[PDB]
Amino acid sequence: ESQYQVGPLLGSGGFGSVYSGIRVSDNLPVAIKHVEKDRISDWGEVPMEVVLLKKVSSGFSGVIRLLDWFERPDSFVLILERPEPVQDLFDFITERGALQEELARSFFWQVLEAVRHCHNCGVLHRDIKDENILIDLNRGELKLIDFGSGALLKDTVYTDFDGTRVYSPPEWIRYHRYHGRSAAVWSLGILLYDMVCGDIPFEHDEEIIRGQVFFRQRVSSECQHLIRWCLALRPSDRPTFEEIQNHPWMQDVLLPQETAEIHLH
Ligand SMILES: NCCCNc1nc(-c2ccccc2O)nc2ccccc12
């Protein structure tokens, strides 16, 4: 209360309410996110989201870092990093339409680096999508947000999910079972299609199940191939992170600052 000055509401939804703010001591820009305890589904040791953020908030990353948190009688309050100026990937794509492949290559690469960092830290995000990706527009750097539906990463089967359905894999739709990495890779396929086409490939359960990809925009063969690989119906047929980043479409990525200079300035 006295440590932060609160500004505008930035967003609200299933994750709670997120406000802009300034840390009073040093003027550091922050985001202040409130969520009601009753609206919290999962807990650890605090909300699971706090556990997962601390595991990935150490060191530098393509993840929005947790700086502090507070418990109130009926809510938890998270103090998060806030780049300025910033825009989420959903609003960016909405404003600009399908992204040029060079731009999509750079963004997608940074998303992959961030997700690998989560996985190395023992964290599975479970809601990778355009709305959960922030763009620092000056540095051309991408940051993941919203670990509110994530879990500790494990090698056994998940039978629960509360992420975004249209990014969820066919095995979740049919069987209510998935494994972490291969489900992550599927959502990455949806994300990459979204970047180069300006919209998601599937809307209904049976389209996800059928897994046929139609391209509504001109997209290179190499990119279509990577997308179709990530969206293989058999989880085991999907690429590993390593195979994604060694894919020919992923070669010669721009540096983030180059990306900002060319595409964001
Ligand atoms: N797509 C909704 C995004 C609303 N804005 C923002 N949302 C969040 C945010 C939203 C949900 C969960 C955790 C989070 O950190 N964190 C932000 C951090 C800095 C700047 C903006 C932010």
mmCIF file of C-alpha atoms and ligand atoms in Angstrom:
data_model
loop_
_atom_site.group_PDB
_atom_site.id
_atom_site.type_symbol
_atom_site.label_atom_id
_atom_site.label_comp_id
_atom_site.label_asym_id
_atom_site.label_seq_id
_atom_site.Cartn_x
_atom_site.Cartn_y
_atom_site.Cartn_z
ATOM 1 C CA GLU A 1 0.000 0.000 0.000
ATOM 2 C CA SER A 2 2.721 2.476 0.944
ATOM 3 C CA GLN A 3 5.404 0.622 -1.094
ATOM 4 C CA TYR A 4 3.538 0.965 -4.405
ATOM 5 C CA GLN A 5 1.655 3.688 -6.185
ATOM 6 C CA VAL A 6 -1.268 2.186 -8.125
ATOM 7 C CA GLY A 7 -2.233 3.332 -11.611
ATOM 8 C CA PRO A 8 -4.653 2.108 -14.337
ATOM 9 C CA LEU A 9 -6.201 -1.364 -14.559
ATOM 10 C CA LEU A 10 -4.253 -3.145 -17.342
ATOM 11 C CA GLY A 11 -6.461 -6.234 -17.588
ATOM 12 C CA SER A 12 -8.771 -8.530 -15.666
ATOM 13 C CA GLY A 13 -10.042 -12.046 -16.258
ATOM 14 C CA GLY A 14 -9.636 -15.605 -14.995
ATOM 15 C CA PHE A 15 -6.149 -14.693 -13.684
ATOM 16 C CA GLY A 16 -7.617 -11.874 -11.517
ATOM 17 C CA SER A 17 -7.042 -8.109 -11.901
ATOM 18 C CA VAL A 18 -3.749 -6.606 -13.043
ATOM 19 C CA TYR A 19 -2.900 -2.925 -12.490
ATOM 20 C CA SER A 20 -0.046 -0.704 -13.578
ATOM 21 C CA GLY A 21 2.078 0.625 -10.760
ATOM 22 C CA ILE A 22 5.279 2.255 -9.625
ATOM 23 C CA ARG A 23 7.473 1.045 -6.802
ATOM 24 C CA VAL A 24 7.605 4.143 -4.595
ATOM 25 C CA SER A 25 11.181 3.615 -3.355
ATOM 26 C CA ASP A 26 12.942 3.756 -6.761
ATOM 27 C CA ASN A 27 10.213 4.533 -9.361
ATOM 28 C CA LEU A 28 10.562 1.019 -10.841
ATOM 29 C CA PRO A 29 7.573 0.256 -13.095
ATOM 30 C CA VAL A 30 5.565 -2.755 -11.811
ATOM 31 C CA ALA A 31 2.369 -4.722 -12.438
ATOM 32 C CA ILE A 32 0.166 -5.415 -9.432
ATOM 33 C CA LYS A 33 -2.043 -8.458 -9.789
ATOM 34 C CA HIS A 34 -4.826 -9.308 -7.362
ATOM 35 C CA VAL A 35 -6.704 -12.568 -7.183
ATOM 36 C CA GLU A 36 -9.434 -13.635 -4.732
ATOM 37 C CA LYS A 37 -8.548 -16.675 -2.614
ATOM 38 C CA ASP A 38 -11.934 -18.265 -3.329
ATOM 39 C CA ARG A 39 -11.153 -17.938 -7.069
ATOM 40 C CA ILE A 40 -7.865 -19.834 -6.573
ATOM 41 C CA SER A 41 -8.009 -23.501 -7.674
ATOM 42 C CA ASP A 42 -4.476 -24.778 -6.950
ATOM 43 C CA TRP A 43 -2.112 -24.339 -3.987
ATOM 44 C CA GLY A 44 1.476 -25.156 -2.964
ATOM 45 C CA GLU A 45 4.157 -24.186 -0.400
ATOM 46 C CA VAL A 46 0.364 -19.978 -1.242
ATOM 47 C CA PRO A 47 -1.129 -20.172 -4.754
ATOM 48 C CA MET A 48 0.705 -22.572 -7.064
ATOM 49 C CA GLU A 49 1.287 -19.589 -9.341
ATOM 50 C CA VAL A 50 3.583 -18.071 -6.658
ATOM 51 C CA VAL A 51 5.486 -21.366 -6.333
ATOM 52 C CA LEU A 52 5.985 -21.622 -10.084
ATOM 53 C CA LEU A 53 6.979 -17.961 -10.508
ATOM 54 C CA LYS A 54 9.705 -18.230 -7.847
ATOM 55 C CA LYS A 55 11.120 -21.263 -9.616
ATOM 56 C CA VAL A 56 11.478 -19.386 -12.916
ATOM 57 C CA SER A 57 12.105 -15.853 -11.599
ATOM 58 C CA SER A 58 15.696 -16.477 -10.699
ATOM 59 C CA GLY A 59 18.174 -15.104 -13.251
ATOM 60 C CA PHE A 60 17.303 -13.247 -16.470
ATOM 61 C CA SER A 61 14.709 -14.622 -18.805
ATOM 62 C CA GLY A 62 11.949 -14.324 -21.352
ATOM 63 C CA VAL A 63 9.639 -14.647 -18.310
ATOM 64 C CA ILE A 64 8.027 -11.719 -16.425
ATOM 65 C CA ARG A 65 9.648 -11.966 -12.981
ATOM 66 C CA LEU A 66 7.908 -12.022 -9.606
ATOM 67 C CA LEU A 67 9.417 -9.249 -7.410
ATOM 68 C CA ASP A 68 7.289 -9.724 -4.315
ATOM 69 C CA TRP A 69 3.876 -10.859 -3.139
ATOM 70 C CA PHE A 70 1.521 -10.179 -0.239
ATOM 71 C CA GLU A 71 -1.254 -12.129 1.404
ATOM 72 C CA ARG A 72 -4.455 -10.323 2.389
ATOM 73 C CA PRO A 73 -7.431 -11.775 4.246
ATOM 74 C CA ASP A 74 -9.344 -12.595 1.041
ATOM 75 C CA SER A 75 -6.779 -12.264 -1.731
ATOM 76 C CA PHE A 76 -3.159 -12.605 -2.813
ATOM 77 C CA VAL A 77 -1.301 -9.709 -4.442
ATOM 78 C CA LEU A 78 1.670 -10.271 -6.769
ATOM 79 C CA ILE A 79 4.201 -7.577 -7.676
ATOM 80 C CA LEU A 80 5.562 -8.291 -11.124
ATOM 81 C CA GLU A 81 8.136 -6.812 -13.493
ATOM 82 C CA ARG A 82 6.679 -4.330 -16.029
ATOM 83 C CA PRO A 83 8.510 -3.320 -19.281
ATOM 84 C CA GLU A 84 7.515 0.058 -20.757
ATOM 85 C CA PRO A 85 6.241 0.384 -23.374
ATOM 86 C CA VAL A 86 4.748 -3.121 -23.636
ATOM 87 C CA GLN A 87 1.908 -4.729 -25.686
ATOM 88 C CA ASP A 88 0.668 -8.305 -25.542
ATOM 89 C CA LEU A 89 1.012 -10.479 -28.685
ATOM 90 C CA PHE A 90 -2.782 -10.778 -29.039
ATOM 91 C CA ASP A 91 -3.210 -6.986 -29.359
ATOM 92 C CA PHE A 92 -0.131 -6.742 -31.570
ATOM 93 C CA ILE A 93 -1.452 -9.329 -34.050
ATOM 94 C CA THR A 94 -4.923 -7.850 -33.854
ATOM 95 C CA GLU A 95 -3.484 -4.434 -34.806
ATOM 96 C CA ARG A 96 -1.040 -5.610 -37.427
ATOM 97 C CA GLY A 97 -2.537 -8.808 -38.890
ATOM 98 C CA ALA A 98 -0.454 -11.818 -39.947
ATOM 99 C CA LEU A 99 3.259 -11.261 -39.122
ATOM 100 C CA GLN A 100 6.075 -11.421 -41.725
ATOM 101 C CA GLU A 101 7.990 -14.679 -41.273
ATOM 102 C CA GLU A 102 11.173 -12.909 -40.234
ATOM 103 C CA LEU A 103 9.245 -11.275 -37.421
ATOM 104 C CA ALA A 104 7.391 -14.508 -36.521
ATOM 105 C CA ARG A 105 10.744 -16.386 -36.549
ATOM 106 C CA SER A 106 12.250 -13.963 -34.024
ATOM 107 C CA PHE A 107 9.195 -13.958 -31.702
ATOM 108 C CA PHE A 108 8.672 -17.722 -31.901
ATOM 109 C CA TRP A 109 12.365 -18.344 -31.181
ATOM 110 C CA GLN A 110 12.186 -16.169 -28.051
ATOM 111 C CA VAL A 111 9.028 -18.019 -26.977
ATOM 112 C CA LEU A 112 10.905 -21.291 -27.355
ATOM 113 C CA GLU A 113 13.877 -19.972 -25.328
ATOM 114 C CA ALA A 114 11.429 -18.907 -22.552
ATOM 115 C CA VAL A 115 9.527 -22.207 -22.454
ATOM 116 C CA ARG A 116 12.790 -24.192 -22.381
ATOM 117 C CA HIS A 117 13.853 -22.032 -19.424
ATOM 118 C CA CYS A 118 10.591 -22.875 -17.612
ATOM 119 C CA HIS A 119 11.067 -26.591 -18.318
ATOM 120 C CA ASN A 120 14.688 -26.465 -17.092
ATOM 121 C CA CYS A 121 13.353 -24.890 -13.903
ATOM 122 C CA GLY A 122 10.841 -27.742 -13.470
ATOM 123 C CA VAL A 123 7.832 -25.617 -14.534
ATOM 124 C CA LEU A 124 5.155 -26.398 -17.141
ATOM 125 C CA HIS A 125 3.219 -23.272 -18.249
ATOM 126 C CA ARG A 126 0.073 -24.989 -19.699
ATOM 127 C CA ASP A 127 -1.396 -21.824 -21.268
ATOM 128 C CA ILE A 128 1.112 -20.737 -23.908
ATOM 129 C CA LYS A 129 -0.761 -18.309 -26.260
ATOM 130 C CA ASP A 130 -0.646 -14.790 -27.766
ATOM 131 C CA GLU A 131 -2.478 -13.222 -24.738
ATOM 132 C CA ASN A 132 0.189 -14.639 -22.366
ATOM 133 C CA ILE A 133 3.126 -13.146 -24.279
ATOM 134 C CA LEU A 134 4.230 -9.550 -23.658
ATOM 135 C CA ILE A 135 6.315 -7.606 -26.156
ATOM 136 C CA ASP A 136 8.831 -5.062 -24.812
ATOM 137 C CA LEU A 137 8.501 -2.828 -27.843
ATOM 138 C CA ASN A 138 11.766 -0.884 -27.345
ATOM 139 C CA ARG A 139 14.017 -3.926 -26.834
ATOM 140 C CA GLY A 140 12.128 -6.362 -29.135
ATOM 141 C CA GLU A 141 12.139 -8.885 -26.225
ATOM 142 C CA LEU A 142 9.197 -11.243 -25.458
ATOM 143 C CA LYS A 143 8.072 -12.135 -21.910
ATOM 144 C CA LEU A 144 5.763 -14.982 -20.775
ATOM 145 C CA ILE A 145 3.030 -14.173 -18.224
ATOM 146 C CA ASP A 146 0.283 -16.060 -16.362
ATOM 147 C CA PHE A 147 1.464 -19.245 -14.703
ATOM 148 C CA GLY A 148 -1.998 -19.427 -13.132
ATOM 149 C CA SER A 149 -2.824 -22.697 -14.877
ATOM 150 C CA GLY A 150 0.690 -24.175 -14.802
ATOM 151 C CA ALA A 151 2.112 -27.129 -12.839
ATOM 152 C CA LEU A 152 5.416 -28.580 -11.700
ATOM 153 C CA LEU A 153 6.780 -30.353 -14.795
ATOM 154 C CA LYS A 154 6.695 -34.188 -14.497
ATOM 155 C CA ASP A 155 7.148 -37.164 -16.816
ATOM 156 C CA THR A 156 3.897 -38.936 -15.894
ATOM 157 C CA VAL A 157 0.456 -38.183 -17.372
ATOM 158 C CA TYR A 158 -1.611 -35.053 -16.558
ATOM 159 C CA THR A 159 -5.354 -35.691 -16.132
ATOM 160 C CA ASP A 160 -6.233 -32.056 -15.321
ATOM 161 C CA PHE A 161 -6.164 -28.908 -17.456
ATOM 162 C CA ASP A 162 -7.549 -25.413 -17.070
ATOM 163 C CA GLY A 163 -5.652 -23.627 -19.814
ATOM 164 C CA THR A 164 -7.106 -22.403 -23.109
ATOM 165 C CA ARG A 165 -9.112 -25.051 -24.982
ATOM 166 C CA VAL A 166 -8.414 -24.017 -28.572
ATOM 167 C CA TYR A 167 -4.673 -24.384 -27.790
ATOM 168 C CA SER A 168 -5.176 -27.765 -26.066
ATOM 169 C CA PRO A 169 -4.028 -30.940 -27.832
ATOM 170 C CA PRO A 170 -6.297 -33.628 -29.316
ATOM 171 C CA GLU A 171 -5.323 -36.173 -26.647
ATOM 172 C CA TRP A 172 -6.754 -33.812 -23.989
ATOM 173 C CA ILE A 173 -9.963 -33.377 -26.017
ATOM 174 C CA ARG A 174 -10.461 -37.158 -26.590
ATOM 175 C CA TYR A 175 -8.976 -38.722 -23.431
ATOM 176 C CA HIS A 176 -8.458 -36.010 -20.834
ATOM 177 C CA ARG A 177 -4.788 -37.137 -20.715
ATOM 178 C CA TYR A 178 -1.594 -35.486 -22.026
ATOM 179 C CA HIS A 179 2.112 -35.355 -21.232
ATOM 180 C CA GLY A 180 3.707 -31.984 -20.556
ATOM 181 C CA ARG A 181 6.278 -31.411 -23.291
ATOM 182 C CA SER A 182 4.290 -32.824 -26.163
ATOM 183 C CA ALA A 183 1.188 -30.847 -25.110
ATOM 184 C CA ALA A 184 3.401 -27.746 -24.870
ATOM 185 C CA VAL A 185 4.680 -28.432 -28.398
ATOM 186 C CA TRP A 186 1.106 -28.637 -29.718
ATOM 187 C CA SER A 187 0.198 -25.261 -28.234
ATOM 188 C CA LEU A 188 3.408 -23.891 -29.779
ATOM 189 C CA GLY A 189 2.140 -25.145 -33.150
ATOM 190 C CA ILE A 190 -1.131 -23.242 -32.627
ATOM 191 C CA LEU A 191 0.849 -20.138 -31.593
ATOM 192 C CA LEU A 192 3.130 -20.200 -34.651
ATOM 193 C CA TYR A 193 0.120 -20.665 -37.007
ATOM 194 C CA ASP A 194 -1.497 -17.743 -35.210
ATOM 195 C CA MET A 195 1.572 -15.540 -35.826
ATOM 196 C CA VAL A 196 1.916 -16.224 -39.549
ATOM 197 C CA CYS A 197 -1.803 -16.432 -40.353
ATOM 198 C CA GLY A 198 -3.194 -13.810 -37.995
ATOM 199 C CA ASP A 199 -5.635 -16.256 -36.372
ATOM 200 C CA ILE A 200 -5.785 -19.690 -34.763
ATOM 201 C CA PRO A 201 -6.181 -22.800 -36.993
ATOM 202 C CA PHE A 202 -8.955 -24.587 -35.018
ATOM 203 C CA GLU A 203 -12.128 -23.321 -33.311
ATOM 204 C CA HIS A 204 -14.121 -26.469 -32.529
ATOM 205 C CA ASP A 205 -13.256 -29.728 -30.768
ATOM 206 C CA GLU A 206 -13.682 -31.836 -33.946
ATOM 207 C CA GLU A 207 -11.316 -29.596 -35.926
ATOM 208 C CA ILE A 208 -8.659 -30.146 -33.209
ATOM 209 C CA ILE A 209 -9.387 -33.924 -33.292
ATOM 210 C CA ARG A 210 -9.237 -34.042 -37.101
ATOM 211 C CA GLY A 211 -5.935 -32.091 -37.013
ATOM 212 C CA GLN A 212 -6.021 -30.942 -40.650
ATOM 213 C CA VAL A 213 -4.277 -27.611 -41.126
ATOM 214 C CA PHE A 214 -5.573 -25.169 -43.767
ATOM 215 C CA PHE A 215 -3.455 -22.058 -44.500
ATOM 216 C CA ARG A 216 -5.543 -18.978 -45.210
ATOM 217 C CA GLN A 217 -2.480 -16.851 -45.869
ATOM 218 C CA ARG A 218 0.635 -17.280 -47.922
ATOM 219 C CA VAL A 219 3.141 -19.141 -45.738
ATOM 220 C CA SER A 220 6.473 -20.709 -46.850
ATOM 221 C CA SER A 221 6.726 -24.492 -47.187
ATOM 222 C CA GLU A 222 9.302 -24.719 -44.436
ATOM 223 C CA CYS A 223 7.079 -22.873 -42.001
ATOM 224 C CA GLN A 224 3.978 -24.905 -42.964
ATOM 225 C CA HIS A 225 6.070 -28.054 -42.401
ATOM 226 C CA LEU A 226 7.209 -26.942 -38.905
ATOM 227 C CA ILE A 227 3.650 -26.007 -38.004
ATOM 228 C CA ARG A 228 2.306 -29.341 -39.230
ATOM 229 C CA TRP A 229 5.020 -31.202 -37.327
ATOM 230 C CA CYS A 230 4.132 -29.453 -34.015
ATOM 231 C CA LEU A 231 0.446 -30.273 -34.704
ATOM 232 C CA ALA A 232 0.943 -34.018 -35.296
ATOM 233 C CA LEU A 233 -2.052 -35.879 -33.863
ATOM 234 C CA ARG A 234 0.122 -38.556 -32.213
ATOM 235 C CA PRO A 235 1.950 -36.822 -29.320
ATOM 236 C CA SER A 236 5.019 -39.005 -29.995
ATOM 237 C CA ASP A 237 5.171 -37.747 -33.621
ATOM 238 C CA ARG A 238 5.690 -34.156 -32.427
ATOM 239 C CA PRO A 239 9.177 -32.553 -32.486
ATOM 240 C CA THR A 240 11.236 -32.027 -29.359
ATOM 241 C CA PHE A 241 12.261 -28.408 -28.539
ATOM 242 C CA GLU A 242 15.663 -29.260 -29.952
ATOM 243 C CA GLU A 243 14.113 -30.434 -33.228
ATOM 244 C CA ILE A 244 12.007 -27.306 -33.444
ATOM 245 C CA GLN A 245 14.995 -24.943 -32.991
ATOM 246 C CA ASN A 246 17.136 -26.999 -35.437
ATOM 247 C CA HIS A 247 14.362 -26.860 -38.054
ATOM 248 C CA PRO A 248 15.398 -25.134 -41.300
ATOM 249 C CA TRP A 249 12.652 -22.473 -40.850
ATOM 250 C CA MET A 250 14.316 -21.432 -37.560
ATOM 251 C CA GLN A 251 17.767 -20.650 -38.940
ATOM 252 C CA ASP A 252 19.393 -17.165 -38.790
ATOM 253 C CA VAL A 253 17.010 -15.610 -36.264
ATOM 254 C CA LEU A 254 17.281 -11.854 -35.769
ATOM 255 C CA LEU A 255 18.582 -10.580 -32.422
ATOM 256 C CA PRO A 256 15.794 -8.964 -30.295
ATOM 257 C CA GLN A 257 17.149 -5.415 -30.778
ATOM 258 C CA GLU A 258 17.424 -5.951 -34.576
ATOM 259 C CA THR A 259 13.850 -7.194 -34.427
ATOM 260 C CA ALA A 260 12.729 -3.997 -32.710
ATOM 261 C CA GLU A 261 14.674 -1.775 -35.160
ATOM 262 C CA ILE A 262 13.217 -3.403 -38.281
ATOM 263 C CA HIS A 263 9.718 -4.393 -37.187
ATOM 264 C CA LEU A 264 8.699 -2.347 -34.157
ATOM 265 C CA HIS A 265 10.178 1.182 -34.748
HETATM 266 N N1 LIG B 1 -3.260 -10.344 -21.914
HETATM 267 C C1 LIG B 1 -3.523 -9.711 -20.612
HETATM 268 C C2 LIG B 1 -2.282 -8.903 -20.199
HETATM 269 C C3 LIG B 1 -2.579 -7.759 -19.148
HETATM 270 N N2 LIG B 1 -1.280 -7.189 -18.736
HETATM 271 C C4 LIG B 1 -0.430 -7.837 -17.917
HETATM 272 N N3 LIG B 1 -0.860 -9.003 -17.358
HETATM 273 C C5 LIG B 1 0.061 -9.635 -16.510
HETATM 274 C C6 LIG B 1 -0.371 -10.936 -15.897
HETATM 275 C C7 LIG B 1 -1.637 -11.432 -16.216
HETATM 276 C C8 LIG B 1 -2.076 -12.652 -15.695
HETATM 277 C C9 LIG B 1 -1.263 -13.399 -14.846
HETATM 278 C C10 LIG B 1 0.007 -12.959 -14.501
HETATM 279 C C11 LIG B 1 0.474 -11.754 -15.028
HETATM 280 O O1 LIG B 1 1.726 -11.317 -14.730
HETATM 281 N N4 LIG B 1 1.305 -9.206 -16.204
HETATM 282 C C12 LIG B 1 1.702 -8.011 -16.790
HETATM 283 C C13 LIG B 1 3.024 -7.548 -16.479
HETATM 284 C C14 LIG B 1 3.449 -6.381 -17.047
HETATM 285 C C15 LIG B 1 2.606 -5.645 -17.934
HETATM 286 C C16 LIG B 1 1.341 -6.081 -18.237
HETATM 287 C C17 LIG B 1 0.872 -7.274 -17.660
#
